[PDB]
Amino acid sequence: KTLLHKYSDIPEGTECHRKAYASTSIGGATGLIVSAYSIALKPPASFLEGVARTGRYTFTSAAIGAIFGLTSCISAQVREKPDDPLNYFIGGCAGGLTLGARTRSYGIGAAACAYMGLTAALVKMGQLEGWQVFAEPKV
Amino acid sequence: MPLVYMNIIMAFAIALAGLLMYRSHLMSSLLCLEGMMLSLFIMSTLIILNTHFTLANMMPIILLVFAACEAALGLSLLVMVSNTYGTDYVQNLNLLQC
Amino acid sequence: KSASSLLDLIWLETILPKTTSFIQMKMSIMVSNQKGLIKLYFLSFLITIMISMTLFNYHE
Amino acid sequence: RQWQPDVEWAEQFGGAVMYPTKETAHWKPPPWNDVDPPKDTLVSNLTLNFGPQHPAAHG
Amino acid sequence: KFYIREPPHGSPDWLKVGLTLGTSVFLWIYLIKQHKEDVLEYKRRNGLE
Amino acid sequence: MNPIIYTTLIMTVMSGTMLVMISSHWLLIWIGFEMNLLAMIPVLMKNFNPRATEAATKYFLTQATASMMLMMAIIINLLYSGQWTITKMFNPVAMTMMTMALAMKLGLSPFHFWVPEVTQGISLQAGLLLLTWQKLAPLSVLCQISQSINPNLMLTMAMLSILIGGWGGLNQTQLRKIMAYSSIAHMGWMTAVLPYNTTMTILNLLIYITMTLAMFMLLIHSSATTTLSLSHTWNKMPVITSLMMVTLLSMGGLPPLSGFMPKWMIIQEMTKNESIIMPTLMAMTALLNLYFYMRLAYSSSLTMFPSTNNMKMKWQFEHTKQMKLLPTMIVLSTLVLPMTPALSSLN
Amino acid sequence: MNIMLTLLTNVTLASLLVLIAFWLPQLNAYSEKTSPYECGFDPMGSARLPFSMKFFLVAITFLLFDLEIALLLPLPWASQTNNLKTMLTMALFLLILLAASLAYEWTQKGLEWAE
Amino acid sequence: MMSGRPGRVPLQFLPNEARSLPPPKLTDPRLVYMGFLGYCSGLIDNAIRRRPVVSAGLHRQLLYVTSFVFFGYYLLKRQDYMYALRDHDMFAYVKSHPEDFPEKDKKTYGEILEEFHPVR
Amino acid sequence: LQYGPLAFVLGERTTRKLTETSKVITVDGNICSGKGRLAREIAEKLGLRHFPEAGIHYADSTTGDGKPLDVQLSGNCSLEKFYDDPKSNDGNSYRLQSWLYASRLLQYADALEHLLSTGQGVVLERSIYSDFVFLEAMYRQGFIRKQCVEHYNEVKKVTACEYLPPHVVVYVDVPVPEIQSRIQKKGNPHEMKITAAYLQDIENAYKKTFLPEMSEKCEVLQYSAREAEDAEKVVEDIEYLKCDKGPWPDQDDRTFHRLRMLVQNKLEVLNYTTIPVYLPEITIGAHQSDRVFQKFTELPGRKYSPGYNEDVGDKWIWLK
Ligand SMILES: COC1=C(OC)C(=O)C(C/C=C(\C)CC/C=C(/C)CC/C=C(/C)CC/C=C(\C)CC/C=C(/C)CC/C=C(\C)CC/C=C(\C)CC/C=C(\C)CC/C=C(/C)CCC=C(C)C)=C(C)C1=O
């Protein structure tokens, strides 16, 4: 979870590059998780094309992470309003556009600029207002 | 926690890897499974002899008696797939697909 | 060409109903099409063990 | 009268999995007994030559 | 008649219906006696009677 | 299978579960777990077909590994506290270890690929046994240890349970397979509320149980394994297929049927405890269940399906095996919502 | 030490015997010696094929009885207890269960070496 | 809201101190519905065995409606019992912990400054 | 109290009843080979219960009043019309074949039930392992399409698997011209126009397939009509048999219990005869299915359970 804190510690806007690097690392982390799942449940033929599968998945996920990070912080600095759902929206769904480009289909990329963008807006929403996804037993 | 505890815990971790990460053999996998309980048996005996838990001295053999029973059926299942399929090689073990 | 067909019978039905149904399409056959090999299932148990253990660090 | 499902309307489920993409084609439906057709005959009696020197035969 | 096989439930199974009726009666009078003793116990317990 | 042997397998399975929910020493809990394991393998092999051997082998491997990890958690909290009493754990990794050890026995997380397959392999009566009775023990252990379970762990695990439960059943026609996936979804449903308050997971366990008997008894009263086979049964048993449809409505949780009550209760207590995002995910994903539920309903009763010529002489024969408790089994699983306050009895 | 010294002495002694056995004699090392043997012939194409067997049941009931033998092993220490009555009844239970398992093995073919 | 309550005898349906509570009336609307709940079980039973649904073996219907209404009655006492206990230690905890429940002061609407929103 | 698990528990053992008078014998052969006469005389000579050849109307002959139903209400196929037109392929050919096969399945079911409950050998005319010949020949003349044939084989594997075989089978071998002479002697016009190709063809399908596929599991005593008229020799050598090949000599009381469990519940005996696969002739329309329901449910003694039908004159229903 310290990797997630490596994103949380950096505030939006200030030191955009380190925030982007943290986003790259987190995208690579989820990328390696999904690549391990693919390499484990889906059987390949040769080690080279298996690690090629992992490379495609990781490089994709890292691309969404990278652009999300950089665009989020630049949106936070140019408008000097880190507390903005759109700040996360634009970069989150440009991540969807880049994902669609990675899978060479801009149709699902456009469909992604809805869903990835809205979800980034919602996670920003929760982070501002303390919305819990995993609430502790309280009452 | 001294090195003996490390060694038997670490032996259990690699038994977990060996049995659970199947290579190609069902018999060798359940062999790793029963080695697993050997590691746990030694581990359990350690604290129990250490702390003078006099009653718990009977827990290992109890823990033993059931565990072999598992293997008692495991290998017993092994023959039942073997006579029809031919081997214990679990890659033909695919008939139940959908 | 704008009220009927393209909007009602092309667009709105594509966005909410058909796109979500296609998502369920594409994610039902990548979820429920495992051959049945005990190996790959067990390595799915495997990497889950560490993701629960150290990667997420559930205990921490 | 109304419409009832044609033979094709019941056919579309069929096919083991009814929402198939590609590899699902090679997913033959199981038989109705739930027992597969008995595989290659392994019945054997392991021929023994029991000889030929074998001095326990007067030689 | 009709079906040449004897019907499986073609005769009044007297014992089973007997126990069903006897039960239902038992459950009923146990129920109302129960309710009466609960209400009486309540009134004599909390000071009503 | 000797009738008396089958009975003695019944009651050793049931006694293995009883030992789980009555014992206090941890070793005894393990003992009951393997008593049940050792006892349920032969009944799964009652038919003795290679599919049954496959299902039994997969069950044995999964559950034996799970019980061994159970002893690992057992040994660790013994080592770090020297107390075999079942209570809050004193070592975190021991708690996690027990969590996945039990989950593999429940089929919640990626440790759930066994259950659809094993359900496919065995006969439908063995399916009823597997998907009804072999949950009470792991649920009871999880209830007894609710004091210290990593809420993140249990919540995400239930989330995947319901999610792959909904998605896996979409592309399945075998009634056993879709029932296994539905059971996985219900597994996620109760295990989501497991950490917060165990009365509600007990209630959802009861409702899922009664619904599952009410379901399986209808299946083997119709004697169907494929969707087309059930569709052919719209003729011979119209009442059975109508009740088929009504309980398939109770499946998803459409009010005022019984199946809505556990969803409602779980969501209400989740919202009592500031978990507002979490319930909406299962609330949406229950539509995934409702989808193949509606497909089964359409194949069963709502639309007439093409029968077969030979099938008509089946008209001359009546189901002789009574398969008792079915009427009340249906009724409790259909109309109990006006009795929701009775949940306080379990508490 | 002591005990371990005896085990070491015995294993090394055995290994010296096998070393002298396998090294001292001289062999011409000709090919046709390697041909395997069966009462004059060679074992055709067998001696490693899967062994279609029946006394597997006897082999497994061995283990199942061995667990119970392990269970009843502590008896000589157990007889030195204050509540001898409970020890008597419960050990007698253990041997009765031994006999009952053997009897069920008996009537239901079982220990009868399968054909 | 309970299994760790002090003095809680296990496997005990109806505890002795429950009798201080008003027993459910024989004409309790919940009870009579669960009596009706008995009818649905009986009516379905004849339908499963393709027996005459309306009047097949009233003996089966009698136990179906009498057993269900009985087990309903005992359940209702326990239902009221737990709700009573939940409300019982309710006030005991509140009275024994006055600090955690401050006496909120009541102020009429003439003293508050709620701002009206022009809805145009 | 039918045969239940309690029956086997309290001491109902089938093995205390089977003796040498427990032979499942079937008489087979060409159409009108006289095998029915041989079955009758064998049954009377050895005290074995005879069963008639299960035809179209076997269901009523086994259930209900015993009175034949309508063809539309039972079978929808006509063997007479099959003779009239075997090439129209409206459905009569293969629907006829499938209905006959499943009626044979019910016949074998009640035969084995009678043997397991009583202990008397049963003699049949053709069985599950015999009827395929006809369809095979019916496919040679083209009366049945290839998909109907493979479906019939699929259902035969799916149904006959659980059923252990006869003991012995007597084949009344008759040459084709003699068979044509016999069908001429009979006089029913429907069985005149039978192609000699079909008549000889079922004979090959019997000779080259039925005997050598059966002979391993059961003893073959194929005979000629010259002998089949003599009732003495046919039963004397049937008596003088070891009956030591097949599953029959080797199956304990447990297999007997499972078999009697299955046969006494006819509903799942023919569970797989429901044909959970869609083919043109076999399939009956949904509207047709509902209508044939509404003209069968009101049929007396078929709406409610036996002993519960007030329409036919049942009594004490309110306490039933
Ligand atoms: C007509 O129809 C017929 C048949 O059928 C139809 C038949 O069938 C047969 C076949 C029948 C026969 C061949 C009959 C045989 C009859 C005999 C009289 C010959 C056998 C005689 C015996 C007394 C039997 C002996 C067998 C015994 C005891 C056991 C048999 C089983 C074995 C496994 C033994 C096999 C042989 C072995 C192992 C070789 C022996 C090796 C040793 C003794 C090694 C010794 C080593 C040491 C001492 C080491 C220590 C040394 C030293 C110096 C110590 C000090 C050293 C230090 C380092 C300290 C016939 C003829 C027939 O007419």
Ligand SMILES: Nc1nc2c(ncn2[C@@H]2O[C@H](COP(=O)(O)OP(=O)(O)OP(=O)(O)O)[C@@H](O)[C@H]2O)c(=O)[nH]1
């Ligand atoms: N299509 C078809 N017809 C069959 C089958 N089995 C029997 N039949 C028909 O059954 C009818 C009666 O056959 P037999 O009993 O041999 O003829 P029979 O004239 O009654 O004379 P006997 O043999 O002496 O009883 C003939 O029309 C056969 O073709 C079958 O499997 N398929």
